[PDB]
Design a binder for this molecule. Structure first.
Ligand SMILES: CC[C@H]1OC(=O)[C@H](C)[C@@H](O[C@H]2C[C@@](C)(OC)[C@@H](O)[C@H](C)O2)[C@H](C)[C@@H](O[C@@H]2O[C@H](C)C[C@H](N(C)C)[C@H]2O)[C@](C)(O)C[C@@H](C)CN(C)[C@H](C)[C@@H](O)[C@]1(C)O
Ligand SMILES: CC[C@H]1OC(=O)[C@H](C)[C@@H](O[C@H]2C[C@@](C)(OC)[C@@H](O)[C@H](C)O2)[C@H](C)[C@@H](O[C@@H]2O[C@H](C)C[C@H](N(C)C)[C@H]2O)[C@](C)(O)C[C@@H](C)CN(C)[C@H](C)[C@@H](O)[C@]1(C)O
Ligand SMILES: [Cl-]
Ligand SMILES: [Cl-]
Ligand SMILES: [Cl-]
Ligand SMILES: [Cl-]
Length: 300
């Protein structure tokens, strides 16, 4: 990244919260829509991450995330951020060790740092997800995250299809696929767990193809266990997903026979998530992108 021109203001901000940084090491990532992010070494040599809230309206999501991280860290063997400073103007935590399993460059180039056909990653993922899914769901709920029963998990997808269908044209081929998914009792979970919600390699750190930390916990919710296995299911060979499922069950996870089927159908319903986002933002650019995903053009 880059050396910021407001170095002195950033050092003052950390200093007034008790964090003394070596300004020679300070770099910033400016691309986030909700936070400005800085990395620096402290005077005692430790590496730090700084998150600067851009607007007061991001503080609610940060407060929930902070409560989740505090209660979750004792229950996972892998690392999560340890917020030693959490205020309106600064969130700061030690840099977690390891390298991201997937990085995206400034021009949009995606680079993978672990292969989805790896048995090592498959077993590491299944182990971490079983530990996460074992976390006490009532203590999870007290943090403020959303909570959905198995009944509410299925009903939310049914409602979501209806709401998106009322505001967007949906190609019949996609609508019929998703209706058949929602009608297949074999796909759907019979129990709810604490989930991450976006567990793909960009939100992990890896060492020797094993997960050593999991990041970006804003999507966490009690609900469908498959959400945390679906990205592996759609990207890994089927025998490698089965290695992940075996490690998941070995850790106390309780998969069901149609779980892999469910994962692929669910991933295909991503255009409904785009539609929901557009309706939430109201921004014309998001509505246009969701509309193109919900009603793709014909082949030529
Ligand atoms: C290459 C030269 C630079 O040195 C560095 O950059 C290294 C990271 C490291 O310096 C190198 C190089 C060397 C040869 O010392 C110069 C070596 O003996 C020390 C141990 O690490 C220094 C000692 C860091 O401090 C050490 O950061 C480590 C990550 C952890 C370590 N400790 C806590 C375990 C800690 O002491 C420190 C945090 O910068 C100390 C800080 C108080 C003073 N710095 C601002 C000075 C001025 C540095 O700019 C430097 C000396 O000019
Ligand atoms: C698993 C790998 C893929 O990762 C995914 O599919 C995510 C789960 C997906 O997200 C999925 C799942 C879901 C539920 O988003 C959470 C759905 O709404 C969207 C449409 O697709 C991402 C996060 C979407 O980015 C999200 O777009 C949403 C509309 C809003 C959301 N944020 C702003 C709130 C934003 O992060 C996005 C539109 O794909 C980002 C886009 C710019 C870049 N993609 C094209 C990359 C290359 C992806 O294909 C991927 C990295 O290869
Ligand atoms: Cl951000
Ligand atoms: Cl939230
Ligand atoms: Cl191993
Ligand atoms: Cl869910």
């Amino acid at each position: 990244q880059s050396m910021p021109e407001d170095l002195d203001a950033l050092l003052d901000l950390a200093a007034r919260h008790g964090l003394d940084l070596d300004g020679g090491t300070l770099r910033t990532e400016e691309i986030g829509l909700d936070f400005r992010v800085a990395f620096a070494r402290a005077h005692d040599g430790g590496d730090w991450v700084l998150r600067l809230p851009r607007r007061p309206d991001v503080l609610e999501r940060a407060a929930v995330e902070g409560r989740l991280l505090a209660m979750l860290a004792p229950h996972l063997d892998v690392a999560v951020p340890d917020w030693r400073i959490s205020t309106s103007e600064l969130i700061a935590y030690p840099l977690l060790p390891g390298s991201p399993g997937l990085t995206v460059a400034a021009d949009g180039e995606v680079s993978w740092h672990v292969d989805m056909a790896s048995t090592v990653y498959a077993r590491s993922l299944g182990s971490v997800v079983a530990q996460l899914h074992a976390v006490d769901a009532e203590a999870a709920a007290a943090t403020g995250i959303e909570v959905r029963s198995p009944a509410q998990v299925r009903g939310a997808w049914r409602q979501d299809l209806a709401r998106v269908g009322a505001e967007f044209e949906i190609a019949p081929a996609l609508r019929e696929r998703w209706e058949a998914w929602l009608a297949d009792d074999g796909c759907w979970p019979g129990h709810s767990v604490l989930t991450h919600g976006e567990l793909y390699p960009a939100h992990t750190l890896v060492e020797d193809e094993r997960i050593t930390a999991v990041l970006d916990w804003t999507t966490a919710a009690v609900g469908d266990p498959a959400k945390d296995l679906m990205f592996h299911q759609v990207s890994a060979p089927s025998a490698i997903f089965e290695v992940a499922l075996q490690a998941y069950a070995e850790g106390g996870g309780r998969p069901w026979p149609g779980l892999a089927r469910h994962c692929t159908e669910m991933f295909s319903a991503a255009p409904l998530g785009y539609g929901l986002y557009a309706l939430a933002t109201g921004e014309a650019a998001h509505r246009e992108a969701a509309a193109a995903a919900l009603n793709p053009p014909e082949e030529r």
